[model samples]
Target chain A: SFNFPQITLWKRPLVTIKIGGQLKEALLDTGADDTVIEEMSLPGRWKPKMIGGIGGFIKVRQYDQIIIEIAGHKAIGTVLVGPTPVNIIGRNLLTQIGATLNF
Target chain B: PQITLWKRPLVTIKIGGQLKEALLDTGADDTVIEEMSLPGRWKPKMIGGIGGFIKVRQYDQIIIEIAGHKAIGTVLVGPTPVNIIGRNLLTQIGATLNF
Candidate 1:
Protein backbone atom coordinates (compact mmCIF):
# COMPACT_ATOMS: atom_id res chain seq x y z
CA SER A 1 0.00 0.00 0.00
CA PHE A 2 1.35 3.41 -1.00
CA ASN A 3 0.86 6.19 1.49
CA PHE A 4 1.28 9.91 1.00
CA PRO A 5 2.97 12.16 3.51
CA GLN A 6 0.63 14.47 5.34
CA ILE A 7 0.78 17.91 3.85
CA THR A 8 -0.22 21.22 5.40
CA LEU A 9 -1.01 24.33 3.46
CA TRP A 10 -0.83 27.99 4.39
CA LYS A 11 -2.11 30.38 1.75
CA ARG A 12 -0.44 33.52 2.98
CA PRO A 13 0.64 35.97 0.35
CA LEU A 14 4.40 36.32 0.10
CA VAL A 15 5.43 39.83 1.09
CA THR A 16 8.42 41.88 0.01
CA ILE A 17 10.15 43.44 3.03
CA LYS A 18 13.05 45.85 2.82
CA ILE A 19 15.50 45.95 5.67
CA GLY A 20 18.01 48.65 6.74
CA GLY A 21 16.47 50.83 4.09
CA GLN A 22 18.46 48.61 1.78
CA LEU A 23 17.24 47.36 -1.55
CA LYS A 24 17.42 43.82 -0.12
CA GLU A 25 14.14 41.97 0.45
CA ALA A 26 12.66 39.34 2.79
CA LEU A 27 9.62 37.15 2.50
CA LEU A 28 6.89 37.26 5.17
CA ASP A 29 5.21 34.07 6.34
CA THR A 30 1.54 34.30 7.32
CA GLY A 31 1.81 31.11 9.35
CA ALA A 32 3.94 32.95 11.88
CA ASP A 33 2.24 34.89 14.67
CA ASP A 34 5.07 37.24 15.57
CA THR A 35 6.92 39.86 13.57
CA VAL A 36 10.67 39.35 13.49
CA ILE A 37 13.45 41.27 11.79
CA GLU A 38 17.10 40.47 11.29
CA GLU A 39 19.14 42.53 13.73
CA MET A 40 22.24 42.17 11.62
CA SER A 41 20.03 43.23 8.74
CA LEU A 42 18.12 46.08 10.46
CA PRO A 43 18.98 49.71 10.10
CA GLY A 44 19.80 52.22 12.88
CA ARG A 45 16.64 54.34 12.96
CA TRP A 46 13.92 51.85 13.88
CA LYS A 47 14.24 50.09 17.25
CA PRO A 48 11.83 47.25 18.11
CA LYS A 49 11.60 45.32 21.35
CA MET A 50 12.71 41.71 21.73
CA ILE A 51 10.43 38.67 21.87
CA GLY A 52 11.11 35.04 22.70
CA GLY A 53 11.08 32.34 20.05
CA ILE A 54 11.41 28.56 19.81
CA GLY A 55 15.18 28.84 20.00
CA GLY A 56 16.06 31.10 22.90
CA PHE A 57 16.11 34.81 23.65
CA ILE A 58 15.84 36.73 20.39
CA LYS A 59 19.17 38.56 20.10
CA VAL A 60 18.27 41.51 17.88
CA ARG A 61 16.89 44.64 19.45
CA GLN A 62 13.41 45.52 18.32
CA TYR A 63 12.73 48.04 15.55
CA ASP A 64 9.81 50.15 14.40
CA GLN A 65 10.70 50.87 10.79
CA ILE A 66 9.53 47.98 8.62
CA ILE A 67 7.75 48.52 5.33
CA ILE A 68 6.07 45.56 3.64
CA GLU A 69 5.01 45.53 0.03
CA ILE A 70 2.70 42.71 -1.13
CA ALA A 71 1.40 42.47 -4.66
CA GLY A 72 2.25 46.13 -5.19
CA HIS A 73 0.53 46.91 -1.87
CA LYS A 74 2.52 48.60 0.89
CA ALA A 75 2.28 48.49 4.69
CA ILE A 76 4.71 49.85 7.25
CA GLY A 77 5.06 48.25 10.69
CA THR A 78 7.36 47.16 13.50
CA VAL A 79 8.98 43.86 14.54
CA LEU A 80 10.18 42.28 17.75
CA VAL A 81 13.81 41.49 18.46
CA GLY A 82 15.39 38.70 20.44
CA PRO A 83 18.76 37.37 21.54
CA THR A 84 18.91 34.69 18.84
CA PRO A 85 15.94 35.15 16.58
CA VAL A 86 15.57 34.46 12.90
CA ASN A 87 13.88 36.90 10.55
CA ILE A 88 10.20 36.28 10.19
CA ILE A 89 7.22 37.99 8.52
CA GLY A 90 4.51 36.86 10.95
CA ARG A 91 0.76 36.40 10.44
CA ASN A 92 -0.42 39.36 12.57
CA LEU A 93 0.85 41.66 9.84
CA LEU A 94 -0.78 39.76 7.02
CA THR A 95 -4.04 38.77 8.73
CA GLN A 96 -5.69 42.11 8.01
CA ILE A 97 -4.88 41.52 4.40
CA GLY A 98 -6.96 38.34 4.42
CA ALA A 99 -4.14 35.83 4.35
CA THR A 100 -5.01 32.17 4.56
CA LEU A 101 -2.90 29.53 6.28
CA ASN A 102 -4.24 26.23 4.99
CA PHE A 103 -2.22 23.61 6.76
CA PRO B 1 14.16 1.97 -12.61
CA GLN B 2 14.94 5.71 -12.50
CA ILE B 3 12.91 6.66 -15.55
CA THR B 4 11.50 9.97 -14.16
CA LEU B 5 7.88 10.69 -15.00
CA TRP B 6 5.26 13.40 -14.63
CA LYS B 7 1.84 14.33 -15.96
CA ARG B 8 2.05 18.11 -16.03
CA PRO B 9 5.16 20.30 -16.37
CA LEU B 10 8.02 19.54 -13.95
CA VAL B 11 11.51 20.90 -14.54
CA THR B 12 14.74 21.41 -12.61
CA ILE B 13 17.25 24.25 -13.13
CA LYS B 14 20.77 24.80 -11.85
CA ILE B 15 20.43 28.06 -9.88
CA GLY B 16 23.58 28.71 -7.87
CA GLY B 17 25.82 31.71 -8.31
CA GLN B 18 26.27 34.23 -5.47
CA LEU B 19 23.14 34.15 -3.34
CA LYS B 20 21.20 31.24 -1.89
CA GLU B 21 19.71 28.37 -3.86
CA ALA B 22 16.21 29.29 -4.99
CA LEU B 23 13.60 26.98 -6.51
CA LEU B 24 10.58 27.78 -8.59
CA ASP B 25 8.69 29.81 -6.00
CA THR B 26 5.25 29.32 -7.46
CA GLY B 27 3.93 31.61 -4.76
CA ALA B 28 6.17 34.44 -5.88
CA ASP B 29 4.99 36.97 -8.44
CA ASP B 30 8.22 38.35 -9.90
CA THR B 31 11.82 37.24 -10.24
CA VAL B 32 13.84 39.21 -7.74
CA ILE B 33 17.62 38.90 -7.75
CA GLU B 34 17.57 40.15 -4.15
CA GLU B 35 18.85 43.37 -2.62
CA MET B 36 21.58 41.36 -0.94
CA SER B 37 23.11 41.05 -4.40
CA LEU B 38 23.37 44.80 -4.92
CA PRO B 39 25.26 47.63 -3.27
CA GLY B 40 22.71 50.37 -2.67
CA ARG B 41 20.24 51.69 -0.14
CA TRP B 42 18.97 48.82 2.04
CA LYS B 43 16.89 50.23 4.86
CA PRO B 44 13.89 49.42 7.02
CA LYS B 45 10.32 50.44 6.17
CA MET B 46 9.26 50.97 9.81
CA ILE B 47 6.19 48.80 9.52
CA GLY B 48 4.70 47.87 12.92
CA GLY B 49 2.67 44.74 13.53
CA ILE B 50 3.28 41.71 15.73
CA GLY B 51 6.98 42.01 16.41
CA GLY B 52 7.16 45.71 15.60
CA PHE B 53 8.23 47.94 12.72
CA ILE B 54 10.65 45.76 10.79
CA LYS B 55 12.94 46.70 7.94
CA VAL B 56 12.16 45.52 4.42
CA ARG B 57 14.23 46.14 1.33
CA GLN B 58 13.33 46.13 -2.36
CA TYR B 59 15.83 46.04 -5.18
CA ASP B 60 15.34 47.10 -8.77
CA GLN B 61 16.60 43.88 -10.26
CA ILE B 62 18.72 40.76 -9.67
CA ILE B 63 20.46 38.40 -12.04
CA ILE B 64 18.66 35.13 -12.62
CA GLU B 65 18.56 32.11 -14.97
CA ILE B 66 15.68 29.74 -15.69
CA ALA B 67 15.83 26.29 -17.32
CA GLY B 68 12.96 24.14 -18.50
CA HIS B 69 12.36 21.52 -21.17
CA LYS B 70 10.52 23.70 -23.67
CA ALA B 71 12.02 27.13 -22.92
CA ILE B 72 14.88 28.47 -20.81
CA GLY B 73 15.21 32.19 -20.10
CA THR B 74 18.23 33.89 -18.66
CA VAL B 75 16.96 36.70 -16.47
CA LEU B 76 20.24 38.64 -16.44
CA VAL B 77 18.25 41.28 -14.59
CA GLY B 78 14.72 42.52 -14.26
CA PRO B 79 13.41 46.05 -14.86
CA THR B 80 10.59 45.70 -12.40
CA PRO B 81 10.27 47.41 -9.01
CA VAL B 82 10.84 44.24 -6.94
CA ASN B 83 12.11 40.61 -7.26
CA ILE B 84 9.33 38.12 -6.70
CA ILE B 85 9.32 36.44 -10.11
CA GLY B 86 5.80 36.96 -11.33
CA ARG B 87 3.78 35.73 -14.33
CA ASN B 88 6.42 36.92 -16.77
CA LEU B 89 8.85 34.24 -15.59
CA LEU B 90 6.40 31.65 -14.28
CA THR B 91 4.70 31.28 -17.63
CA GLN B 92 8.03 30.24 -19.09
CA ILE B 93 9.57 27.95 -16.43
CA GLY B 94 8.79 25.22 -13.89
CA ALA B 95 10.44 24.85 -10.45
CA THR B 96 9.92 24.04 -6.77
CA LEU B 97 11.82 24.27 -3.47
CA ASN B 98 11.93 22.69 0.00
CA PHE B 99 13.17 23.90 3.39
Candidate 2:
Protein backbone atom coordinates (compact mmCIF):
# COMPACT_ATOMS: atom_id res chain seq x y z
CA SER A 1 0.00 0.00 0.00
CA PHE A 2 1.17 3.51 -0.84
CA ASN A 3 0.33 6.41 1.38
CA PHE A 4 0.86 10.07 0.55
CA PRO A 5 0.74 12.56 3.39
CA GLN A 6 -1.45 15.60 3.23
CA ILE A 7 0.59 18.49 1.91
CA THR A 8 0.00 22.18 1.70
CA LEU A 9 -2.00 23.08 -1.37
CA TRP A 10 0.49 25.82 -2.19
CA LYS A 11 2.55 23.07 -3.78
CA ARG A 12 1.24 20.70 -6.44
CA PRO A 13 0.69 17.00 -5.78
CA LEU A 14 3.20 15.87 -8.37
CA VAL A 15 4.81 12.44 -8.43
CA THR A 16 7.47 10.78 -10.52
CA ILE A 17 6.27 8.31 -13.09
CA LYS A 18 7.96 6.03 -15.61
CA ILE A 19 6.42 5.76 -19.06
CA GLY A 20 7.96 4.23 -22.13
CA GLY A 21 11.05 3.58 -20.04
CA GLN A 22 11.47 7.30 -19.40
CA LEU A 23 11.17 9.11 -16.09
CA LYS A 24 8.73 12.02 -15.85
CA GLU A 25 6.69 13.96 -13.32
CA ALA A 26 2.92 13.96 -13.35
CA LEU A 27 0.04 15.21 -11.27
CA LEU A 28 -2.22 12.77 -9.41
CA ASP A 29 -5.55 14.18 -10.44
CA THR A 30 -8.84 12.90 -9.09
CA GLY A 31 -11.01 15.25 -11.11
CA ALA A 32 -9.85 13.94 -14.45
CA ASP A 33 -11.55 10.86 -15.85
CA ASP A 34 -8.68 9.94 -18.17
CA THR A 35 -4.93 10.24 -17.98
CA VAL A 36 -3.37 12.88 -20.23
CA ILE A 37 0.25 13.54 -21.02
CA GLU A 38 2.06 16.28 -22.86
CA GLU A 39 3.15 15.94 -26.46
CA MET A 40 5.58 13.07 -26.64
CA SER A 41 6.59 10.27 -28.97
CA LEU A 42 5.41 6.83 -27.90
CA PRO A 43 5.65 3.58 -29.80
CA GLY A 44 2.50 2.08 -31.41
CA ARG A 45 -0.42 3.56 -33.29
CA TRP A 46 -2.85 5.99 -31.70
CA LYS A 47 -6.30 7.25 -32.59
CA PRO A 48 -7.47 10.83 -32.73
CA LYS A 49 -9.77 11.86 -29.91
CA MET A 50 -10.99 14.94 -28.10
CA ILE A 51 -11.16 15.38 -24.31
CA GLY A 52 -13.22 17.95 -22.47
CA GLY A 53 -12.13 19.69 -19.27
CA ILE A 54 -12.89 22.69 -17.08
CA GLY A 55 -12.36 25.10 -19.92
CA GLY A 56 -13.16 23.21 -23.11
CA PHE A 57 -12.13 20.27 -25.24
CA ILE A 58 -8.78 19.54 -26.88
CA LYS A 59 -7.86 17.05 -29.54
CA VAL A 60 -5.51 14.32 -28.43
CA ARG A 61 -3.90 11.07 -29.54
CA GLN A 62 -5.24 8.11 -27.62
CA TYR A 63 -2.77 5.33 -26.94
CA ASP A 64 -4.18 2.14 -25.47
CA GLN A 65 -2.55 -0.42 -23.20
CA ILE A 66 0.29 1.88 -22.26
CA ILE A 67 2.37 0.86 -19.25
CA ILE A 68 3.11 3.51 -16.66
CA GLU A 69 4.89 3.19 -13.33
CA ILE A 70 3.46 5.75 -10.95
CA ALA A 71 5.50 6.14 -7.76
CA GLY A 72 6.64 2.55 -7.99
CA HIS A 73 3.19 1.18 -8.77
CA LYS A 74 2.67 -0.35 -12.20
CA ALA A 75 -0.50 0.48 -14.13
CA ILE A 76 -1.31 -0.30 -17.73
CA GLY A 77 -4.14 1.49 -19.44
CA THR A 78 -5.16 4.06 -22.04
CA VAL A 79 -3.10 7.25 -22.05
CA LEU A 80 -3.94 10.36 -24.00
CA VAL A 81 -1.18 12.51 -25.46
CA GLY A 82 -2.05 16.12 -26.05
CA PRO A 83 -0.99 19.72 -25.54
CA THR A 84 -1.89 19.71 -21.88
CA PRO A 85 -0.47 22.21 -19.41
CA VAL A 86 0.93 19.34 -17.41
CA ASN A 87 1.03 15.53 -17.34
CA ILE A 88 -1.88 14.12 -15.38
CA ILE A 89 -2.43 10.62 -13.94
CA GLY A 90 -6.16 10.48 -13.72
CA ARG A 91 -8.73 8.02 -12.34
CA ASN A 92 -8.07 5.48 -15.10
CA LEU A 93 -4.60 4.72 -13.76
CA LEU A 94 -5.22 5.77 -10.17
CA THR A 95 -7.79 3.03 -9.76
CA GLN A 96 -5.38 0.43 -11.06
CA ILE A 97 -3.02 1.39 -8.24
CA GLY A 98 -5.86 1.39 -5.66
CA ALA A 99 -5.62 5.11 -5.13
CA THR A 100 -8.23 6.66 -2.91
CA LEU A 101 -8.96 9.99 -1.29
CA ASN A 102 -8.73 9.75 2.49
CA PHE A 103 -9.49 12.37 5.02
CA PRO B 1 -12.66 8.35 5.91
CA GLN B 2 -11.80 6.96 2.51
CA ILE B 3 -13.40 7.80 -0.81
CA THR B 4 -13.05 5.36 -3.67
CA LEU B 5 -13.02 6.32 -7.33
CA TRP B 6 -15.72 3.84 -8.30
CA LYS B 7 -17.58 6.93 -9.42
CA ARG B 8 -17.03 10.67 -9.38
CA PRO B 9 -15.72 11.63 -5.90
CA LEU B 10 -18.28 14.32 -5.49
CA VAL B 11 -19.40 15.43 -2.04
CA THR B 12 -21.75 17.95 -0.57
CA ILE B 13 -20.13 21.30 0.13
CA LYS B 14 -21.58 24.32 1.83
CA ILE B 15 -20.44 27.72 0.59
CA GLY B 16 -21.94 30.97 1.72
CA GLY B 17 -24.69 28.96 3.36
CA GLN B 18 -25.58 27.39 -0.01
CA LEU B 19 -25.25 23.66 -0.58
CA LYS B 20 -23.71 22.21 -3.74
CA GLU B 21 -21.81 19.17 -4.88
CA ALA B 22 -18.20 19.49 -5.91
CA LEU B 23 -15.49 17.19 -7.13
CA LEU B 24 -12.40 16.68 -5.03
CA ASP B 25 -9.76 17.60 -7.57
CA THR B 26 -6.23 16.91 -6.47
CA GLY B 27 -4.86 18.13 -9.78
CA ALA B 28 -6.30 21.59 -9.34
CA ASP B 29 -4.10 24.01 -7.43
CA ASP B 30 -6.91 26.26 -6.33
CA THR B 31 -10.57 25.86 -5.48
CA VAL B 32 -12.96 26.98 -8.18
CA ILE B 33 -16.72 27.24 -8.03
CA GLU B 34 -19.25 27.82 -10.78
CA GLU B 35 -20.66 31.23 -11.50
CA MET B 36 -22.27 32.54 -8.32
CA SER B 37 -22.78 35.79 -6.51
CA LEU B 38 -20.48 36.23 -3.55
CA PRO B 39 -20.25 39.14 -1.16
CA GLY B 40 -16.69 40.36 -1.13
CA ARG B 41 -14.00 42.17 -3.06
CA TRP B 42 -12.31 39.99 -5.62
CA LYS B 43 -9.53 40.30 -8.15
CA PRO B 44 -9.77 39.13 -11.71
CA LYS B 45 -7.51 36.21 -12.48
CA MET B 46 -7.06 33.41 -14.95
CA ILE B 47 -6.55 29.73 -14.05
CA GLY B 48 -5.65 26.96 -16.47
CA GLY B 49 -6.89 23.38 -16.30
CA ILE B 50 -6.63 20.22 -18.39
CA GLY B 51 -8.05 21.87 -21.51
CA GLY B 52 -7.49 25.62 -21.24
CA PHE B 53 -7.65 28.73 -19.12
CA ILE B 54 -10.67 30.56 -17.77
CA LYS B 55 -11.18 34.00 -16.24
CA VAL B 56 -12.25 34.03 -12.59
CA ARG B 57 -12.68 36.25 -9.59
CA GLN B 58 -10.52 35.32 -6.63
CA TYR B 59 -12.12 35.74 -3.24
CA ASP B 60 -10.00 35.13 -0.17
CA GLN B 61 -10.92 34.01 3.33
CA ILE B 62 -14.01 32.15 2.19
CA ILE B 63 -15.58 29.61 4.51
CA ILE B 64 -16.52 26.29 2.99
CA GLU B 65 -17.82 23.15 4.60
CA ILE B 66 -16.79 19.99 2.80
CA ALA B 67 -18.41 16.80 3.99
CA GLY B 68 -19.14 18.52 7.27
CA HIS B 69 -15.56 19.68 7.68
CA LYS B 70 -15.09 23.42 7.89
CA ALA B 71 -12.27 25.04 5.97
CA ILE B 72 -11.50 28.65 5.25
CA GLY B 73 -9.46 29.50 2.17
CA THR B 74 -9.40 31.21 -1.18
CA VAL B 75 -12.17 30.40 -3.63
CA LEU B 76 -12.32 31.30 -7.33
CA VAL B 77 -15.64 32.02 -8.96
CA GLY B 78 -15.75 31.43 -12.69
CA PRO B 79 -17.52 29.77 -15.59
CA THR B 80 -16.45 26.24 -14.86
CA PRO B 81 -18.41 23.18 -15.96
CA VAL B 82 -18.64 22.05 -12.33
CA ASN B 83 -17.57 23.03 -8.85
CA ILE B 84 -14.07 21.84 -7.98
CA ILE B 85 -12.67 21.41 -4.47
CA GLY B 86 -8.99 21.75 -5.17
CA ARG B 87 -5.96 21.04 -3.04
CA ASN B 88 -6.10 24.43 -1.45
CA LEU B 89 -9.07 23.40 0.64
CA LEU B 90 -8.53 19.68 0.50
CA THR B 91 -5.29 20.07 2.39
CA GLN B 92 -7.11 21.86 5.15
CA ILE B 93 -9.37 18.85 5.51
CA GLY B 94 -6.28 16.64 5.83
CA ALA B 95 -7.03 14.77 2.65
CA THR B 96 -4.47 12.51 1.07
CA LEU B 97 -4.20 10.02 -1.75
CA ASN B 98 -3.82 6.55 -0.40
CA PHE B 99 -3.43 3.26 -2.18
Candidate 3:
Protein backbone atom coordinates (compact mmCIF):
# COMPACT_ATOMS: atom_id res chain seq x y z
CA SER A 1 0.00 0.00 0.00
CA PHE A 2 1.18 3.50 -0.74
CA ASN A 3 1.29 5.31 2.60
CA PHE A 4 0.62 8.89 1.47
CA PRO A 5 0.95 11.80 3.85
CA GLN A 6 -1.88 13.90 5.39
CA ILE A 7 -2.12 17.02 3.21
CA THR A 8 -4.84 15.57 0.99
CA LEU A 9 -6.60 13.56 3.70
CA TRP A 10 -6.59 16.41 6.21
CA LYS A 11 -7.85 19.12 3.90
CA ARG A 12 -10.37 18.17 1.19
CA PRO A 13 -8.18 15.40 -0.19
CA LEU A 14 -6.60 17.44 -2.92
CA VAL A 15 -4.09 15.60 -5.09
CA THR A 16 -2.23 16.11 -8.32
CA ILE A 17 -3.76 14.29 -11.27
CA LYS A 18 -2.39 14.11 -14.79
CA ILE A 19 -4.81 14.03 -17.71
CA GLY A 20 -4.03 14.48 -21.40
CA GLY A 21 -0.50 15.57 -20.55
CA GLN A 22 -1.80 18.30 -18.26
CA LEU A 23 -1.47 18.10 -14.50
CA LYS A 24 -3.92 19.73 -12.12
CA GLU A 25 -5.06 19.63 -8.51
CA ALA A 26 -8.17 17.53 -7.92
CA LEU A 27 -10.30 16.91 -4.88
CA LEU A 28 -11.04 13.33 -3.89
CA ASP A 29 -14.77 13.57 -3.51
CA THR A 30 -16.58 10.47 -2.31
CA GLY A 31 -19.80 12.45 -2.50
CA ALA A 32 -19.55 13.12 -6.24
CA ASP A 33 -20.94 10.62 -8.74
CA ASP A 34 -18.46 11.18 -11.57
CA THR A 35 -15.05 12.74 -11.98
CA VAL A 36 -15.40 16.41 -12.88
CA ILE A 37 -12.56 18.52 -14.19
CA GLU A 38 -12.15 22.07 -15.29
CA GLU A 39 -13.00 22.45 -18.99
CA MET A 40 -9.79 22.08 -20.93
CA SER A 41 -8.62 20.71 -24.23
CA LEU A 42 -8.47 16.94 -24.25
CA PRO A 43 -8.52 14.07 -26.74
CA GLY A 44 -12.02 12.51 -26.82
CA ARG A 45 -15.60 12.86 -27.97
CA TRP A 46 -17.94 14.28 -25.32
CA LYS A 47 -21.66 14.68 -24.79
CA PRO A 48 -23.24 17.67 -23.10
CA LYS A 49 -25.01 17.29 -19.77
CA MET A 50 -25.90 19.22 -16.65
CA ILE A 51 -24.55 18.13 -13.28
CA GLY A 52 -26.48 19.14 -10.19
CA GLY A 53 -24.88 19.91 -6.86
CA ILE A 54 -25.86 21.14 -3.37
CA GLY A 55 -26.89 24.57 -4.56
CA GLY A 56 -26.46 24.75 -8.35
CA PHE A 57 -25.88 22.87 -11.56
CA ILE A 58 -23.32 23.31 -14.31
CA LYS A 59 -23.32 22.22 -17.92
CA VAL A 60 -20.47 19.85 -18.69
CA ARG A 61 -19.07 17.77 -21.46
CA GLN A 62 -18.99 14.09 -20.53
CA TYR A 63 -16.27 12.11 -22.22
CA ASP A 64 -16.87 8.37 -22.23
CA GLN A 65 -13.28 7.16 -21.90
CA ILE A 66 -10.23 9.20 -20.94
CA ILE A 67 -6.93 8.39 -19.33
CA ILE A 68 -6.16 9.81 -15.87
CA GLU A 69 -3.01 9.39 -13.81
CA ILE A 70 -2.75 9.66 -10.02
CA ALA A 71 0.16 8.74 -7.81
CA GLY A 72 1.68 6.71 -10.68
CA HIS A 73 -1.57 4.76 -11.01
CA LYS A 74 -3.30 4.97 -14.39
CA ALA A 75 -7.01 4.56 -15.14
CA ILE A 76 -9.37 4.94 -18.11
CA GLY A 77 -12.87 6.15 -17.31
CA THR A 78 -15.45 8.86 -17.79
CA VAL A 79 -14.18 12.40 -17.28
CA LEU A 80 -16.31 15.52 -17.22
CA VAL A 81 -15.03 18.96 -18.15
CA GLY A 82 -16.85 22.17 -17.52
CA PRO A 83 -17.07 25.38 -15.55
CA THR A 84 -16.35 23.96 -12.13
CA PRO A 85 -14.90 25.70 -9.13
CA VAL A 86 -12.53 22.78 -8.69
CA ASN A 87 -11.59 19.40 -10.14
CA ILE A 88 -13.28 16.41 -8.53
CA ILE A 89 -12.08 12.81 -8.51
CA GLY A 90 -15.28 10.91 -7.74
CA ARG A 91 -16.13 7.27 -7.01
CA ASN A 92 -15.93 6.24 -10.68
CA LEU A 93 -12.17 6.75 -10.77
CA LEU A 94 -11.61 6.43 -7.04
CA THR A 95 -12.66 2.78 -7.22
CA GLN A 96 -10.03 2.13 -9.83
CA ILE A 97 -7.50 3.74 -7.50
CA GLY A 98 -8.64 1.24 -4.84
CA ALA A 99 -9.33 3.92 -2.27
CA THR A 100 -10.79 2.77 1.03
CA LEU A 101 -12.27 4.95 3.72
CA ASN A 102 -11.32 3.15 6.90
CA PHE A 103 -9.33 3.61 10.03
CA PRO B 1 -6.90 -7.82 1.71
CA GLN B 2 -10.28 -7.21 0.09
CA ILE B 3 -12.82 -4.95 1.79
CA THR B 4 -16.44 -4.03 1.20
CA LEU B 5 -17.40 -0.54 0.10
CA TRP B 6 -20.44 1.70 0.40
CA LYS B 7 -21.89 3.50 -2.63
CA ARG B 8 -22.29 6.73 -0.70
CA PRO B 9 -19.95 6.26 2.24
CA LEU B 10 -22.65 7.21 4.70
CA VAL B 11 -22.24 6.73 8.44
CA THR B 12 -24.49 7.13 11.45
CA ILE B 13 -22.95 9.40 14.06
CA LYS B 14 -24.39 10.52 17.38
CA ILE B 15 -24.06 14.17 18.33
CA GLY B 16 -25.46 15.47 21.60
CA GLY B 17 -27.49 12.26 21.87
CA GLN B 18 -29.04 12.92 18.45
CA LEU B 19 -28.25 10.44 15.73
CA LYS B 20 -27.93 11.55 12.12
CA GLU B 21 -26.69 10.26 8.78
CA ALA B 22 -23.71 12.06 7.32
CA LEU B 23 -21.70 11.67 4.17
CA LEU B 24 -18.02 10.95 4.72
CA ASP B 25 -16.59 13.43 2.22
CA THR B 26 -12.84 13.60 2.19
CA GLY B 27 -13.42 16.48 -0.21
CA ALA B 28 -14.99 18.45 2.61
CA ASP B 29 -12.64 20.54 4.70
CA ASP B 30 -14.80 20.60 7.84
CA THR B 31 -17.81 18.83 9.35
CA VAL B 32 -21.15 20.50 8.66
CA ILE B 33 -24.50 19.89 10.34
CA GLU B 34 -27.81 20.92 8.84
CA GLU B 35 -29.62 22.04 11.96
CA MET B 36 -28.57 21.10 15.46
CA SER B 37 -28.75 22.99 18.73
CA LEU B 38 -25.46 22.59 20.55
CA PRO B 39 -24.52 23.58 24.04
CA GLY B 40 -21.90 26.21 24.95
CA ARG B 41 -21.03 29.17 22.74
CA TRP B 42 -20.03 29.11 19.09
CA LYS B 43 -18.27 31.68 16.96
CA PRO B 44 -19.76 32.59 13.62
CA LYS B 45 -17.77 31.52 10.60
CA MET B 46 -18.19 30.73 6.90
CA ILE B 47 -17.12 27.78 4.74
CA GLY B 48 -16.87 27.53 0.97
CA GLY B 49 -18.08 24.55 -1.06
CA ILE B 50 -18.57 23.59 -4.71
CA GLY B 51 -22.13 24.84 -4.42
CA GLY B 52 -20.78 28.14 -3.16
CA PHE B 53 -20.50 29.36 0.43
CA ILE B 54 -22.72 29.21 3.50
CA LYS B 55 -22.87 30.73 6.96
CA VAL B 56 -22.04 28.55 9.94
CA ARG B 57 -21.30 28.66 13.62
CA GLN B 58 -18.03 27.00 14.50
CA TYR B 59 -18.02 25.15 17.82
CA ASP B 60 -14.51 24.62 19.06
CA GLN B 61 -15.48 21.64 21.17
CA ILE B 62 -18.03 19.05 20.07
CA ILE B 63 -18.45 15.47 21.17
CA ILE B 64 -19.14 13.14 18.26
CA GLU B 65 -19.63 9.41 18.50
CA ILE B 66 -18.82 7.45 15.36
CA ALA B 67 -19.21 3.68 15.17
CA GLY B 68 -18.79 3.46 18.98
CA HIS B 69 -15.61 5.57 18.82
CA LYS B 70 -16.02 8.82 20.70
CA ALA B 71 -14.26 11.84 19.26
CA ILE B 72 -14.07 15.51 20.14
CA GLY B 73 -13.33 18.22 17.56
CA THR B 74 -14.63 21.22 15.67
CA VAL B 75 -18.21 20.92 14.37
CA LEU B 76 -19.79 23.58 12.16
CA VAL B 77 -23.57 24.09 12.49
CA GLY B 78 -25.64 25.90 9.95
CA PRO B 79 -28.53 25.67 7.48
CA THR B 80 -26.93 23.06 5.31
CA PRO B 81 -28.73 20.71 2.97
CA VAL B 82 -26.80 17.73 4.20
CA ASN B 83 -24.54 16.63 7.05
CA ILE B 84 -20.91 15.94 6.16
CA ILE B 85 -18.18 14.31 8.27
CA GLY B 86 -15.02 16.08 7.21
CA ARG B 87 -11.38 15.41 8.07
CA ASN B 88 -11.35 17.72 11.09
CA LEU B 89 -13.16 15.11 13.18
CA LEU B 90 -12.09 12.15 11.06
CA THR B 91 -8.44 12.78 11.91
CA GLN B 92 -9.18 12.72 15.63
CA ILE B 93 -11.08 9.45 15.15
CA GLY B 94 -7.96 8.03 13.51
CA ALA B 95 -9.71 7.67 10.17
CA THR B 96 -7.52 6.70 7.27
CA LEU B 97 -7.78 6.39 3.51
CA ASN B 98 -6.24 3.21 2.18
CA PHE B 99 -5.59 2.72 -1.50
What ranking of all candidate models by lDDT puts the best one first?
A: 2, 3, 1
Maximum-TM-score candidate: 2
The C-alpha RMSD in Å for every predicted model, in order, reads 15.3, 2.3, 2.7
For residues A1-103, write the lDDT of model 3, one tens digit per residue.
Answer: 1235343366456678999898898877777778999979877578999887655577889997798997567889999899788899888888888887776
Candidate 2 residue lDDT tens string, B1-99: 789987889999999889999999989888999989888899999998767889999999999999999999999999999899998898899888776
Off by over 4 Å in 1: A1-15, A19-21, A25-27, A40-48, A81-86, B1-99
Deviation (Å) of B67 in candidate 2: 0.9
What interface RMSD, in Å and to 1 decimal, does model 1 have? Answer: 13.3
Winning candidate number (lDDT)? 2
Candidate 1 on A1-103: residue-level lDDT in tens? 1111111212223335554454424454422445665545554565544453222234456566566554345556666655322345555555434433220
Pairs that collide in candidate 3 are none
Provide the lDDT at A25 for model 3. Answer: 87
**Residue A22 lDDT, candidate 3, scale 0-100:** 83
DockQ of 2: 0.72
TM-score, chain B, each candidate: 0.33, 0.97, 0.90
Fnat of candidate 3, please?
A: 0.50
Error of 1 at B9 (Å): 33
